[model samples]
Target: MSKNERDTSFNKNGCLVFVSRLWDLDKLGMFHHPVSAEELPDYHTVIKRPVDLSSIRDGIEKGTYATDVDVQNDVARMITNALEYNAKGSTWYQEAMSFRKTYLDLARQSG
Candidate 1:
């Protein structure tokens, strides 16, 4: 959904809190704008699943070559990328991104 589809009359306190964190991040540039209530499209709307997952899974699991780790990594990457890019004006965005790295680190330690 675009910004037009959302209630953009004003910014909520929750949004300002997120913008505060994002601006403080060392890597992502300082997003100066007072968190405008912008509506962004979802992952399903942005990234199309061009292939059948079951078929792909079968191919990877039996047909040619596939590893369990590869599948797991794909799952993590797809989800994180979606949250990282497709998400917008969400209070959860910062938490998601922050946890993404933390989870990835934990996964690596556990894997």
Candidate 2:
């Protein structure tokens, strides 16, 4: 996705690439934005600290991330929330499983 994308402010451009890949893979908008309360009333109750692609992207541009580890943590957190909040048979759960594998592998390369 974001091949060799870099900013002088952040040295972990490879990690940024990882983010771009996952962000683009969200073709169904499942992981794109924060889960709304009304959209999923029990969402907040289930997920205490919700994270999403949009927020992570902004964090990248705002210099909120210092290392790949920082980015990886949030990505994992996001995916884990998905896995826990939805049933195994659900599309969200399956996609979250896929995302988790992709990131762990990509993180190995990026980090």
Candidate 3:
């Protein structure tokens, strides 16, 4: 995709992001924002399949993407907590917790 197309700042793509989020809210019983394929002419092409932008944004806000300065500290803190608090001290347990924390943080930030 073109760099510009990737920037969902204040255009069709951006609008669709919200639309998709609304679809999620509607599904999750959070809140409803009406959307229809007719309204999103390119929904079939851009976001061809249903997606979980909710989780994506949730991950970002939590701090999964270490490269992002905004949540790097949070991500590190979560990883530290995961390793520190793995009850059984199992490497797999620590890894699993850390992995989920990262995904949630990154998803939150996306929105």
Candidate 4:
């Protein structure tokens, strides 16, 4: 039950769309490597395989996924970065996290 950061936010619910996309690309052998733990945690166990990613992608896409957005987003960014191979891109992985930090600060104030 090790909940990741995306489990703490609203990003997970929307992450599956991309995860599925990643799988499709992979099944076609389009990706250089399989999805890694740094991207998505094992839904059931710690074992990671190329086929496992498809299952994860399906669960997330089907709404059968039980994790939170924080968890999902963490996984999503992992997939995105793994597939894209860059921290700087349109997904806003680095920028969004940075913005959220400042946004949280403002949100916490009662001025």
For each candidate, give its TM-score against the true structure.
Answer: 0.37, 0.64, 0.26, 0.26
> Which is better, 2 or 4, measured by lDDT?
2
Instruction: Write the candidate numbers in order of decreasing TM-score.
Output: 2, 1, 4, 3
lDDT of 2 by residue, 38-109 (tens): 878888677887776676667766869666666666566765665676555766567757666776567545
Model 4 compared with the native: what TM-score? 0.26
Query: What overall lDDT, based on C-alpha atoms, would model 4 receive against the true structure?
Result: 0.43
| Model 1 ranges with Cα > 4 A deviation | 1-45, 50-65
Candidate with best lDDT:
2
Candidate with better lDDT, 3 vs 4: 4
Worst 10 residues of 4 by lDDT: 102-111
lDDT of 3 by residue, 1-111 (tens): 333433332122323443443333233444432236786675554434433447535554453444434343443443344334333556656555545554444434453
Residue 97, model 2: Cα distance from true site in angstroms: 1.4
lDDT string for model 4 (1-111, tens) is 324434433344244334434444344444434446666465224323243556655654565644453344445445434433333455445544444443323322211
lDDT of 2: 0.62
Task: Give the Å shift of residue 26 in candidate 2.
Answer: 3.6
Among all windows of 10 consecutive residues in model 2, the one with the lowest summed lDDT is: 1-10
Candidate 2: deviation at residue 107, Å?
2.3
Query: Candidate 4 deviates by what RMSD?
Result: 11.5
Candidate 1 local lDDT, 6-93, one digit each (tens): 2323122223333343344424555332222244344354554322345544543362423335444544564454464536656566
